[PDB]
Design a protein around this motif. Sequence first.
Motif, PDB file in Angstrom:
ATOM      1  N   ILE A   1       0.828  -1.197   0.000  1.00 36.38           N
ATOM      2  CA  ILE A   1       0.000   0.000   0.000  1.00 36.38           C
ATOM      3  C   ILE A   1       0.863   1.248   0.000  1.00 36.38           C
ATOM      4  CG2 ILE A   1      -1.580   1.339   1.409  1.00 36.38           C
ATOM      5  CD1 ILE A   1      -2.875  -0.799  -0.221  1.00 36.38           C
ATOM      6  N   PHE A   2       1.758   1.348   0.969  1.00 38.22           N
ATOM      7  CA  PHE A   2       2.495   2.572   1.209  1.00 38.22           C
ATOM      8  C   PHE A   2       3.914   2.498   0.681  1.00 38.22           C
ATOM      9  CE2 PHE A   2       4.788   5.311   4.423  1.00 38.22           C
ATOM     10  CZ  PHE A   2       4.436   6.499   3.811  1.00 38.22           C
ATOM     11  N   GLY A   3       4.448   1.299   0.523  1.00 42.79           N
ATOM     12  CA  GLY A   3       5.793   1.121   0.033  1.00 42.79           C
ATOM     13  C   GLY A   3       6.696   0.599   1.118  1.00 42.79           C
ATOM     14  N   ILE A   4       6.580   1.165   2.306  1.00 45.50           N
ATOM     15  CA  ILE A   4       7.410   0.733   3.414  1.00 45.50           C
ATOM     16  C   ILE A   4       6.518   0.277   4.550  1.00 45.50           C
ATOM     17  CG2 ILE A   4       9.381   2.169   2.807  1.00 45.50           C
ATOM     18  CD1 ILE A   4       8.404   3.970   5.164  1.00 45.50           C
ATOM     19  N   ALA A   5       7.056  -0.631   5.342  1.00 44.00           N
ATOM     20  CA  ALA A   5       6.336  -1.181   6.466  1.00 44.00           C
ATOM     21  C   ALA A   5       7.335  -1.428   7.573  1.00 44.00           C
ATOM     22  CB  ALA A   5       5.627  -2.477   6.086  1.00 44.00           C
ATOM     23  N   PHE A   6       6.861  -1.324   8.807  1.00 42.91           N
ATOM     24  CA  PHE A   6       7.607  -1.894   9.912  1.00 42.91           C
ATOM     25  C   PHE A   6       7.662  -3.403   9.747  1.00 42.91           C
ATOM     26  CE2 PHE A   6       5.778   2.021  11.621  1.00 42.91           C
ATOM     27  CZ  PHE A   6       6.908   2.635  12.114  1.00 42.91           C
ATOM     28  N   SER A   7       8.793  -3.992  10.104  1.00 43.12           N
ATOM     29  CA  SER A   7       8.885  -5.427  10.285  1.00 43.12           C
ATOM     30  C   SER A   7       9.352  -5.782  11.680  1.00 43.12           C
ATOM     31  CB  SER A   7       9.834  -6.059   9.261  1.00 43.12           C
ATOM     32  OG  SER A   7      11.175  -5.699   9.496  1.00 43.12           O
TER      33      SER A   7
ATOM     34  N   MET B   1       1.663 -16.714   0.700  1.00 47.42           N
ATOM     35  CA  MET B   1       1.886 -15.743  -0.365  1.00 47.42           C
ATOM     36  C   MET B   1       3.374 -15.475  -0.520  1.00 47.42           C
ATOM     37  SD  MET B   1      -1.025 -12.785  -0.519  1.00 47.42           S
ATOM     38  CE  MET B   1      -2.641 -13.201   0.110  1.00 47.42           C
ATOM     39  N   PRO B   2       3.863 -15.295  -1.750  1.00 47.30           N
ATOM     40  CA  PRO B   2       5.311 -15.196  -1.964  1.00 47.30           C
ATOM     41  C   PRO B   2       5.861 -13.880  -1.445  1.00 47.30           C
ATOM     42  CG  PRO B   2       4.185 -14.699  -3.990  1.00 47.30           C
ATOM     43  CD  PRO B   2       3.130 -15.173  -3.023  1.00 47.30           C
ATOM     44  N   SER B   3       7.185 -13.823  -1.355  1.00 48.70           N
ATOM     45  CA  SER B   3       7.852 -12.638  -0.841  1.00 48.70           C
ATOM     46  C   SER B   3       7.795 -11.504  -1.864  1.00 48.70           C
ATOM     47  CB  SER B   3       9.297 -12.956  -0.482  1.00 48.70           C
ATOM     48  OG  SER B   3       9.371 -13.890   0.577  1.00 48.70           O
ATOM     49  N   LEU B   4       8.154 -10.306  -1.413  1.00 46.62           N
ATOM     50  CA  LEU B   4       8.202  -9.157  -2.309  1.00 46.62           C
ATOM     51  C   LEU B   4       9.609  -8.942  -2.856  1.00 46.62           C
ATOM     52  CD1 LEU B   4       5.835  -6.495  -0.773  1.00 46.62           C
ATOM     53  CD2 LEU B   4       5.414  -8.230  -2.529  1.00 46.62           C
ATOM     54  N   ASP B   5      10.563  -8.670  -1.974  1.00 46.38           N
ATOM     55  CA  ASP B   5      11.943  -8.466  -2.393  1.00 46.38           C
ATOM     56  C   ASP B   5      12.918  -9.066  -1.392  1.00 46.38           C
ATOM     57  OD1 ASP B   5      11.000  -6.613  -0.576  1.00 46.38           O
ATOM     58  OD2 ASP B   5      12.160  -4.934  -1.369  1.00 46.38           O
TER      59      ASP B   5
ATOM     60  N   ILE C   1      12.009   1.881  -0.736  1.00 45.93           N
ATOM     61  CA  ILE C   1      10.883   1.051  -1.143  1.00 45.93           C
ATOM     62  C   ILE C   1      11.349  -0.182  -1.900  1.00 45.93           C
ATOM     63  CG2 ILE C   1       8.955   1.012  -2.794  1.00 45.93           C
ATOM     64  CD1 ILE C   1       8.181   3.788  -1.793  1.00 45.93           C
ATOM     65  N   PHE C   2      12.195  -0.005  -2.911  1.00 44.27           N
ATOM     66  CA  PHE C   2      12.509  -1.099  -3.818  1.00 44.27           C
ATOM     67  C   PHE C   2      13.796  -1.835  -3.476  1.00 44.27           C
ATOM     68  CE2 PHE C   2      10.154   2.089  -6.401  1.00 44.27           C
ATOM     69  CZ  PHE C   2       9.001   1.354  -6.584  1.00 44.27           C
ATOM     70  N   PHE C   3      14.683  -1.231  -2.686  1.00 42.95           N
ATOM     71  CA  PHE C   3      15.986  -1.808  -2.373  1.00 42.95           C
ATOM     72  C   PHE C   3      16.201  -1.916  -0.872  1.00 42.95           C
ATOM     73  CE2 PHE C   3      17.907  -1.752  -6.583  1.00 42.95           C
ATOM     74  CZ  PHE C   3      17.076  -0.875  -7.241  1.00 42.95           C
ATOM     75  N   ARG C   4      15.123  -1.980  -0.100  1.00 43.31           N
ATOM     76  CA  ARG C   4      15.236  -2.230   1.324  1.00 43.31           C
ATOM     77  C   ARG C   4      15.753  -3.640   1.570  1.00 43.31           C
ATOM     78  NH1 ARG C   4       9.121  -3.727   3.465  1.00 43.31           N
ATOM     79  NH2 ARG C   4       8.741  -5.260   1.808  1.00 43.31           N
TER      80      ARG C   4
ATOM     81  N   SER D   1      18.245   1.891   9.107  1.00 43.08           N
ATOM     82  CA  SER D   1      18.732   2.990   9.923  1.00 43.08           C
ATOM     83  C   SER D   1      19.569   3.959   9.102  1.00 43.08           C
ATOM     84  CB  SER D   1      19.520   2.426  11.096  1.00 43.08           C
ATOM     85  OG  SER D   1      18.858   1.291  11.627  1.00 43.08           O
ATOM     86  N   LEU D   2      20.229   3.472   8.049  1.00 39.32           N
ATOM     87  CA  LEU D   2      20.750   4.386   7.041  1.00 39.32           C
ATOM     88  C   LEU D   2      19.613   5.098   6.321  1.00 39.32           C
ATOM     89  CD1 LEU D   2      22.966   5.652   5.349  1.00 39.32           C
ATOM     90  CD2 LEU D   2      22.947   3.617   3.921  1.00 39.32           C
ATOM     91  N   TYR D   3      18.509   4.402   6.069  1.00 38.07           N
ATOM     92  CA  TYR D   3      17.422   5.002   5.306  1.00 38.07           C
ATOM     93  C   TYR D   3      16.600   5.976   6.141  1.00 38.07           C
ATOM     94  CZ  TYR D   3      18.205   1.839   1.406  1.00 38.07           C
ATOM     95  OH  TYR D   3      18.731   1.164   0.335  1.00 38.07           O
ATOM     96  N   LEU D   4      16.318   5.643   7.399  1.00 37.19           N
ATOM     97  CA  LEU D   4      15.607   6.583   8.256  1.00 37.19           C
ATOM     98  C   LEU D   4      16.509   7.725   8.683  1.00 37.19           C
ATOM     99  CD1 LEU D   4      14.103   3.917  10.477  1.00 37.19           C
ATOM    100  CD2 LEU D   4      12.699   5.558   9.293  1.00 37.19           C
ATOM    101  N   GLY D   5      17.765   7.419   8.988  1.00 37.79           N
ATOM    102  CA  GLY D   5      18.687   8.452   9.396  1.00 37.79           C
ATOM    103  C   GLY D   5      19.066   9.403   8.282  1.00 37.79           C
ATOM    104  N   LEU D   6      19.003   8.951   7.030  1.00 38.12           N
ATOM    105  CA  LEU D   6      19.116   9.890   5.919  1.00 38.12           C
ATOM    106  C   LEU D   6      17.812  10.648   5.718  1.00 38.12           C
ATOM    107  CD1 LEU D   6      21.073   8.014   3.060  1.00 38.12           C
ATOM    108  CD2 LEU D   6      21.848   9.990   4.350  1.00 38.12           C
ATOM    109  N   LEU D   7      16.681   9.971   5.929  1.00 40.38           N
ATOM    110  CA  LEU D   7      15.387  10.634   5.890  1.00 40.38           C
ATOM    111  C   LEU D   7      15.274  11.671   6.989  1.00 40.38           C
ATOM    112  CD1 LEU D   7      12.570  10.321   4.350  1.00 40.38           C
ATOM    113  CD2 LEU D   7      11.785   9.429   6.554  1.00 40.38           C
ATOM    114  N   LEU D   8      15.806  11.361   8.173  1.00 42.30           N
ATOM    115  CA  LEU D   8      15.797  12.308   9.277  1.00 42.30           C
ATOM    116  C   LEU D   8      16.598  13.553   8.933  1.00 42.30           C
ATOM    117  N   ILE D   9      17.707  13.390   8.220  1.00 38.90           N
ATOM    118  CA  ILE D   9      18.579  14.524   7.943  1.00 38.90           C
ATOM    119  C   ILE D   9      18.067  15.348   6.775  1.00 38.90           C
ATOM    120  CG2 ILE D   9      20.893  15.093   7.144  1.00 38.90           C
ATOM    121  CD1 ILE D   9      20.454  14.469  10.197  1.00 38.90           C
TER     122      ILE D   9
END
Lengths: 80, 341, 38, 32, 34, 34, 30, 36, 27, 50, 29, 62, 504, 30
Positions: B245-251, J46-50, K20-23, N9-17
């Motif tokens: 939905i949003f692209g990112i999620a907590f895991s 359901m399969p994984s995303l990435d 989004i795509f490379f997490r 944490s690289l992604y949030l910490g870059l988002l934070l900055i």
Amino acid sequence: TTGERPFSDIITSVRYWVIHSITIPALFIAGWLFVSTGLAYDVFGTPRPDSYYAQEQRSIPLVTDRFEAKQQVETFLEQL
Amino acid sequence: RGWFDILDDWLKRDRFVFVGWSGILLFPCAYLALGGWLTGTTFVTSWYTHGLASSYLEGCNFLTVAVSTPANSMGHSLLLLWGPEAQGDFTRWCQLGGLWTFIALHGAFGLIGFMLRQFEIARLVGVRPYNAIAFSAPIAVFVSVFLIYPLGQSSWFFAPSFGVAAIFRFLLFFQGFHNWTLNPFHMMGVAGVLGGALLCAIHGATVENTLFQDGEGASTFRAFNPTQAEETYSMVTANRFWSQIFGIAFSNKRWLHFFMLFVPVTGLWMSAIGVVGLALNLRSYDFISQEIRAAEDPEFETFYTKNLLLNEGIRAWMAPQDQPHENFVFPEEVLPRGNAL
Amino acid sequence: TITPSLKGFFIGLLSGAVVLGLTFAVLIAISQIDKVQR
Amino acid sequence: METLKITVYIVVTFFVLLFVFGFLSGDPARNP
Amino acid sequence: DWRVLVVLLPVLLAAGWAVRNILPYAVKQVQKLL
Amino acid sequence: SYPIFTVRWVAVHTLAVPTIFFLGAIAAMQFIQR
Amino acid sequence: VNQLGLIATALFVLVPSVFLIILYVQTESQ
Amino acid sequence: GGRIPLWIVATVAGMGVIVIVGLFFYGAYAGLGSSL
Amino acid sequence: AQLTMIAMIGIAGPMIIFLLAVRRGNL
Amino acid sequence: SWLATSHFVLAFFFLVGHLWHAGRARAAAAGFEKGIDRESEPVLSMPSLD
Amino acid sequence: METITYVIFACIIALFFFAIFFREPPRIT
Amino acid sequence: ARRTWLGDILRPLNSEYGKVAPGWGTTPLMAVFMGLFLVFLLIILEIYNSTLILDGVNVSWK
Amino acid sequence: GLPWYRVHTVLINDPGRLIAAHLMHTALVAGWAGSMALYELATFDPSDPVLNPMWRQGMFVLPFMARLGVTGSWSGWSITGETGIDPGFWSFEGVALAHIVLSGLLFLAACWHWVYWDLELFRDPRTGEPALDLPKMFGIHLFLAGLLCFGFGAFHLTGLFGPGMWVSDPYGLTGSVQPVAPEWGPDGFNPYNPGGVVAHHIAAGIVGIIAGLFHILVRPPQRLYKALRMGNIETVLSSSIAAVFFAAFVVAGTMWYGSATTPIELFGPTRYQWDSSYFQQEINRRVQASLASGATLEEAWSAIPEKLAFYDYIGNNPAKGGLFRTGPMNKGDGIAQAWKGHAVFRNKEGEELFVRRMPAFFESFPVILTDKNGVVKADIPFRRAESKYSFEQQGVTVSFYGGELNGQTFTDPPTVKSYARKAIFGEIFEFDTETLNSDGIFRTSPRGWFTFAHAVFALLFFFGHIWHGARTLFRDVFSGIDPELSPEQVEWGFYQKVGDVTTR
Amino acid sequence: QPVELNRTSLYLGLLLILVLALLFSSYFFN
Ligand code: CLA
Ligand code: CLA
Ligand SMILES: C=Cc1c(C)c2cc3nc(c4c5[nH]c(cc6nc(cc1[nH]2)C(C)=C6CC)c(C)c5C(=O)[C@@H]4C(=O)OC)[C@@H](CCC(=O)OC/C=C(\C)CCC[C@H](C)CCC[C@H](C)CCCC(C)C)[C@@H]3C
Ligand SMILES: CC1=C(/C=C/C(C)=C/C=C/C(C)=C/C=C/C=C(C)/C=C/C=C(C)/C=C/C2=C(C)CCCC2(C)C)C(C)(C)CCC1
Ligand SMILES: [Fe+2]
């Protein structure tokens, strides 16, 4: 589950309303006679509807002092 | 087992409302402040500090009642009832704004007492003191605004008053005089509060819509007993929902709930830093580069210069009434007015 | 001598110790009555 | 303007017909 | 003062008739703690 | 078999005894003539 | 504007951005 | 103890509220603070 | 008065519910 | 003003009530309005995303 | 110097694209 | 581990770790200095504030 | 591994590398104070402390050096008004160079204590663990603090071996560095009395020496050691952070409210000296003391010092700048070249009109000319069509007394109105908006900036006190709560006391 | 001790900055 009488058991007991049919109305009446007998206007210094202004005067009786400020309010009250 | 150990037993005794050692400091002071708000909003005028009606006795309603601040002439007087301004007289003390400092100082001490309570209960129930750490953001908001901001200004008069419309005065004061919307530390607070309210609403509805079916009824709240050690909701589905939905999620459910601690507490701590700056009138009032542009170009209009025109409206129309001590006698022609209004 | 706000500070600090001390006087009293059974 | 109007109009209705037909093309069926 | 004797007179009539009904129930609770 | 005058009794009454007093006081304000 | 207005931001973007990228390459490499 | 049904208490204490807030909302229009 | 209407209009709602409780009716 | 605002308060909530009940009645006709079955959770199938 | 600094926003979109795509993916564990 | 020259002259000043004094100790002597500091700071609070006004103490530049 | 915010926690069980990390912080702080004062020397214009003093130039640490006797430069300038002075080694250069020389020396000491962490002094002899005797360490440092509190008060501040401190007249005109005697009576708790600041440090130094001797020779109670977790050094962190935010709250107040420690020739006027019109009352007190001698207005106003009328100007109020209005106060109004004079406003009636001065809240303020009897007699109108009290209508002229324009009168209402919008700011001054591109946007003084940092640090250190006190009292639980935490432990009424398993 | 900084944490910490500097660049240029 700590020890006290449950609130399902106090306010439903009739001994509660032996006490509280004559104390809940009594304090509502006590609070009424705080305002109706005028004591509210004297404990706290809130003016009556005929006590904001002197008869011709329309200025705000505003405090301009700090250590001469209790006597200043009284000067505004002796004005009324 | 002497009297300190015995008083420790009775204070930490397992009862309905937990008293504790903090209850010596919380339970009178939190009750004198809230009992003094209700005493001031029912019975105490602002007719000598502000020239206002602010009690139910005068005719005000719950929105318009307040315990108003002291006069500007009081300064940052502590305004003790026994102090040199009230001189013992309770009737005089309420008129001089003494109940404002009664509430702003007992409420200050009760908020210490509630924050100490959060430490004391977490030390007894064996949990981490993160609720006390998260309560540092309402402390810092109460400390910066009700205490530090008037201490930076000329008196307690410019602190907010304990009232619904009086807070609304204080919000509209800070727009006109401080341009507090434009301040970046308030925007981090808006991003923190609305982020908190979003993360309240999102995490609340995500859990409630990823629940496991544990009961055979269509009302799902009775499918949870608290002694169970199962996840009551599907964090895997919840992560796959929000990832698409949003692209990112907590895991990480621990990182999610730390982020829920982090976001309103960092927001309310950032708003504190702005209000401490506004105590010294260190506003982000103006972008100097734009008012250089707009003062030699009379066609460059942005929404920024429109807000500054609104603040000149607030600062000249509100102030002869908002600030009666200054004796602002603004004539009917110095008032900034647009056409036809 | 003692200025009138000096004896105000005395009155407040002694009332504040009447407020604090009699608070703990009752809390010592009720704790001596309501000891927890160990 | 004369051309972009019907350009947007066809683009809108094709995405809207894709919306309406795909929810008509058995959206109750597509449940786990 | 007269008015403070009329604000407090239903109050002192409240607590008295409150303590006139839990009077034996107070002597049973203080005795049980002692 | 319960106590009567607990800590909770003091938490209840120190709020709710002036609450009813204030609600009688605010309800007397609704009849103040101007 | 301020002529130190980009250096105030470039050393606000890149100074922790260099820090969090240094931290990431030293923990990617284990 | 459980002599009085708790709903009767809950239906007249909840009716004490709306009488009083109904008295408070009436006094918005009567006497002081009524703009009259 | 308008109140004694709204009192007996208002009281006699729960008195339906009072009767069916004190008659063990189909509450 | 009274009629437009009351019938906006009501009409918005009736959109919310539509979103509530249309989501629920389609969750009810498919059989997961009471929750996810743990033994047959779809995403772990359901399969994984990435 | 002004706008081309502000156009920081292009780094945010690249972070929006990367996170989004490379997490590093969630792992069922 | 590296036993140095200054490490020996100050070794008695770091060789009493955890040696508590038994009981409640001097906590009453401390609480009555806890309290006098509380009265002292409240004195100088109220002087600065002009809550406590004193003989010959003008809390102003002049 | 370690989280990024936990990287310094490799120094808790390493006291030798705690000393090294501290030596490096102290090297960076002493290095900054040398670097800031040398940069301040490179930008200080010293040739006019009357109208361009250190607080107009955003001199941050130049007043802190000044307030303890450091007065001259090797260049030749003294801040007190002279040129050609030899102040010896302790100049603003020599103090700054001593701080850089200290910083290199604390650097190499930090390099030594980082490599040689493994000294036996930290290792406990009874258990082989690196241990700090924090009660005995405290009394040693409290003894040293009181030795350096007494000696600073009783030698430096008293002047017996030392310069003294910056003393002032109340209006800050002839303020200099003098030795100050200790005030031992109740007037020593007046913060504006500098004799109490000397007498504090003598008395608190002795009490700190006495207490430092106490905490050396008296051990903590068994119940005070365990309540605070005095074995842990996070409790020294949480109570020291508690101290430094209290102390930063105090210096935020005593900078903002003003004290003897924070004089107005060094940090500027306070905002409360503009609120009270504290310099305007003094300026009119001098003028009426010549208006009763017979000295006429042009004479009785050409005797007001330019430094005194500069304090009665709103661009020196520290509550008048802004958070990103950066730089010196001279980046705002400008460099004050001379006093333009006291603008006296008279109408065509020739009756004196007094401009409503602007409060520090206001960005904009309408120009409104009241009389001595308070009623508004003239104003610059917003809407001018239906006007009644314009400068053009009421014939308002402006006359200047003293200053540049001594004996000049402007009657033409555009020039009267320009001087009227500057008379809402107090005394009118002629500014150099050409030295440093002064855009008129008011700035803040070193008094206002210091209060902002040290009340935002003190608030940020309130959270740090809370966090590190949380870490101390809850040290067993910051990995998490017990997996074997019983449900009957937090269940109500399973224990008679919350927390204790023997009260079931 | 090694420093771990995972990619989020690289992604949030870059988002934070970056959203901090997108905020404050308007004020640093002023
Ligand atoms: C070695 C001796 C030494 C000397 C003679 C100086 C001298 C100076 N320093 Mg420097 N400094 C030093 C070491 C020294 N420094 C070191 C080691 C550092 C790194 C930590 C610094 C970092 C530093 C900075 C950042 C600054 C200075 C500044 C200054 C100047 C003004 C000091 C001042 O007024 O602040 C006031 C000093 C104090 C208030 C001391 C604090 C003591 C507090 C109040 C004690 C309270 C807690 C206490 C322990 C409680 C118990 C007390 C007990 C007795 C009861 C002065 C020229 C200022 C300057 O102008 O730079 C050019 C400045 O900004 N110094
Ligand atoms: C003298 C005061 C002091 C000392 C010696 C410490 C020491 C510590 N803190 Mg504490 N803390 C303090 C004050 C202090 N703190 C204050 C004022 C706050 C509120 C802001 C906190 C809030 C705090 C939190 C929430 C946490 C700590 C943690 C820690 C530990 C790890 C630090 C680390 O590795 O960060 C690594 C730091 C960086 C990688 C740099 C980024 C830090 C920020 C974003 C910028 C730093 C500011 C700048 C570089 C210079 C500051 C100048 C100064 C004047 C403020 C270490 C024991 C951590 C802990 O307890 O773990 C067990 C932890 O989670 N501290
Ligand atoms: C206006 C907004 C607002 C209110 C009314 C509020 C209220 C509360 N917050 C609490 C808690 C918290 N709030 C927290 C985070 C937040 N809290 C927030 C904002 C608020 N929080 C925000 C935005 C955050 C996000 C950072 C946390 C983490 C907690 C808690 O742990 C605690 C809780 O457990 O909640 C369930 C409780 C405080 C109990 C207490 O400390 O008694 C002390 C009472 C005293 C000292 C008497 C009050 C005196 C106050 C200080 C001033 C007087 C005010 C008058 C009485 C009324 C004036 C009203 C006018 C202004 C209109 C109570 C539910
Ligand atoms: C219990 C409860 C509660 C309470 C509630 C309440 C308080 C209620 C009220 C109720 C009520 C109070 C009700 C009432 C009702 C009534 C009704 C429903 C009526 C009816 C009537 C009618 C229908 C009328 C008719 C008529 C007419 C029309 C004319 C002719 C005559 C007559 C009069 C008959 C709550 C929620 C809080 C919570 C818990 C539970
Ligand atoms: Fe949750």
